[PDB]
């Protein structure tokens, strides 16, 4: 397969569906990336993560840098070998989880972030950025944005200077700018000038609320190169994903999928009303959990603090997200995504 | 299949190998029964428990009686349906975990214990007994033993008076008597007079140490009917199992399989010497964990408090026990068990 190839198979308004081809596999887009904190997707074997339909997972660099150490994982064969996932892995750059000078952060520099991700053997490397607090003054937003762009250039150069990394991995840049249109535009132009394999929209999902996140996406995503993947970092709830895809986003990650997702909205399985409910978590869900166990059982397990409860809840939730992504992909492919988004919402809410 | 049929296919000294046929499946003996506390074998799906080679699991009545309640599980379809295990289940009677009058224990009577196990849908019901503290004075041992035998009769009658239970399930009686030969003999004769499907040796593995446990087994197991299964409750360590089989025991249960069993003895995977060990937990073990992950990875997981660490450690350990039982079964079948026991021990220690 190539190092990196993004192809758009179909479109509807700003939404797109297609594929990212990488040496370790193909990623169907719009994509949801389960989060593996500490070299594991919580409570799931990789084979289970893959059976839910995930094409790619996200590796949490900050934690790995602290344990087991990036150098140790490299000696051990790389993250893929270590945890037993052989498909693409995206690594964040560590800044975000760490939260200060122009050279980096003490507690990590653009150079050391890129090196750590290489040591982990990441397939999609994130540039090292400075996330901007919300809310932010225009001056402070600007300063932070500016630093990040400087750091994006340093990231690019560090990535390119490492031949095995440049030839086998991809590099994504991260747009910053808080909620300010002019700042987002300067950030997009600066990253397009440097040139990246894909473009993340950073600095959102940091307490601004869905209306303001969607308002910023409305002008920010069209500033990014159309022909490259658009990743919204840290999002999110099913409703957020649907609206983000409608605004041109292709890739997502979220941590925490007793809350269970259903097509009728989320439920909390700890609720006493589920103690004798023999129905599965969701009535339509095709996942193994919903094939085999009841609400009543999982209810008991979670209230009992049993590990099988977390295993089963997480498999379901990640399977639900994957099925959501599949329905978004299929509806765009068939040009009925706007109808799917309306039907989804009516029911979900 | 019949309600209950025990057949002995082969023998060597006091050791035996054969099968117990029950309506929900066949149990290969000598058998190890994984323990499901709170209607789950800790950190394992039932399909995983079965893939390790378990033929039967033990259900923990005391906990189930407290949550979710035996009546609730019955309404929900029985323990098998509830937790998704369709093979035989053995239930303890609850006394042991609860730890007082002739009628039962307040905090459970022979009658209520039998009824609860029926409500759970148990395949092998344990009589309700009074476990005797260790150490015990001869007088106190005797009194306790006597009560238990009285309670064994009440258990028998309660079981038999419930037609669906008597026709579909089996009842095991429990020998008591502390470490005193005369008391064990009175206990065995009293239970044989009542008549049971199988005979457990109770009151051991309660701090007496392996030498004294083996000394008591030496005279106690031959007192039980030869043609029925002999169950040693609560045992135990691999070395204990091997010596117990050599003394005529057919069935076992143990809770807690960072400790990992290997044919070279137990290891503690938390030990820093495993942080970069790429070997599997055990060099010969055929389980999925040893096929796929390293010591170094599981080491990281356990130290990180990750749930995948417990899942992987427990699958390995229960698979190891099952492989141990298989090698005991095969060696008796081939009349080389005493040689296997010696080779095992040399290596294990
Ligand atoms: C939960 N919301 C959220 N907003 C984010 C914003 C950023 C960001 O701006 N930059 C980087 N590197 N990471 C981010 C992350 C971690 C994504 O898992 C975010 N996560
Ligand atoms: C861990 N050692 C042990 N000794 C036991 C002794 C007894 C006993 O004497 N009677 C009953 N009912 N249960 C027992 C149990 C629970 C077995 O999981 C024991 N467990
Ligand atoms: Zn499901
Ligand atoms: Zn193993």
From Swiss-Prot, chains A, B:
Keyword Flavoprotein: no
Enzymatic reactions: 7-aminomethyl-7-carbaguanine + guanosine(34) in tRNA = 7-aminomethyl-7-carbaguanosine(34) in tRNA + guanine
Cofactors: Zn(2+)
EC top class named in words: transferase
Role summary: Catalyzes the base-exchange of a guanine (G) residue with the queuine precursor 7-aminomethyl-7-deazaguanine (PreQ1) at position 34 (anticodon wobble position) in tRNAs with GU(N) anticodons (tRNA-Asp, -Asn, -His and -Tyr). Catalysis occurs through a double-displacement mechanism. The nucleophile active site attacks the C1' of nucleotide 34 to detach the guanine base from the RNA, forming a covalent enzyme-RNA intermediate. The proton acceptor active site deprotonates the incoming PreQ1, allowing a nucleophilic attack on the C1' of the ribose to form the product.
Family, per entry: Belongs to the queuine tRNA-ribosyltransferase family.
Protein name: Queuine tRNA-ribosyltransferase
Record-level GO cellular component terms: cytosol
One GO MF term: tRNA-guanosine(34) queuine transglycosylase activity
NCBIfam families named among the record's database cross-references: Q_tRNA_tgt, tgt_general
Active-site residues, record numbering mapped to chain: 92, 253
């Amino acid at each position: 397969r190539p190092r990196f190839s993004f192809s758009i198979a179909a479109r509807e308004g700003k939404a797109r569906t297609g594929t990212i081809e990488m040496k370790r596999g193909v990623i169907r887009t719009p994509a949801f990336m389960p989060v593996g904190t500490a070299a594991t997707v919580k409570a799931l074997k990789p084979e289970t993560v893959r059976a839910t339909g995930a094409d790619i997972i996200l590796g949490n660099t900050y934690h790995l840098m602290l344990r087991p150490g990036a150098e140790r994982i490299a000696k051990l064969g790389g993250l893929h070998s270590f945890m037993g996932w052989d498909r693409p892995i995206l690594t964040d750059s560590g800044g975000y989880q760490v939260m200060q000078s122009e050279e980096g952060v003490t507690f990590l520099s653009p150079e050391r972030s890129i090196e750590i991700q290489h040591l982990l053997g990441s397939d999609i490397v994130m540039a090292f950025d400075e996330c901007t607090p919300y809310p932010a003054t225009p001056s402070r937003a600007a300063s932070s944005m500016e630093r990040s762009m400087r750091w994006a250039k340093r990231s690019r150069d560090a990535f390119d200077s490492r031949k095995e990394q440049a030839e086998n991995a991809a590099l994504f840049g991260i747009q910053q700018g808080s909620v300010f249109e002019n700042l987002r535009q300067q950030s997009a132009d600066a990253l397009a000038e440097i040139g990246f394999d894909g473009y993340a929209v950073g600095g959102l999902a940091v307490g601004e609320g869905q209306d303001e996140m969607f308002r910023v996406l409305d002008f920010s995503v069209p500033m990014l190169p159309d022909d490259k993947p658009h990743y919204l970092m840290g999002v999110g709830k099913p409703d957020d994903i649907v609206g983000a895809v409608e605004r041109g986003i292709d890739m997502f990650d979220c941590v925490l999928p007793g809350q269970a997702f259903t097509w009728d909205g989320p439920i909390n399985i700890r609720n006493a009303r589920f103690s004798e409910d023999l129905k599965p978590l969701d009535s339509e869900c095709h996942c193994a959990v919903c094939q085999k166990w009841s609400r009543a059982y999982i209810h008991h397990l979670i209230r009992a603090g049993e590990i099988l409860g977390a295993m089963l809840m997480t498999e379901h939730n990640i399977a639900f997200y994957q099925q959501l992504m599949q329905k978004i992909r299929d509806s765009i492919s068939e040009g009925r995504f706007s109808q799917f988004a309306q039907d989804f919402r009516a029911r979900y809410f």
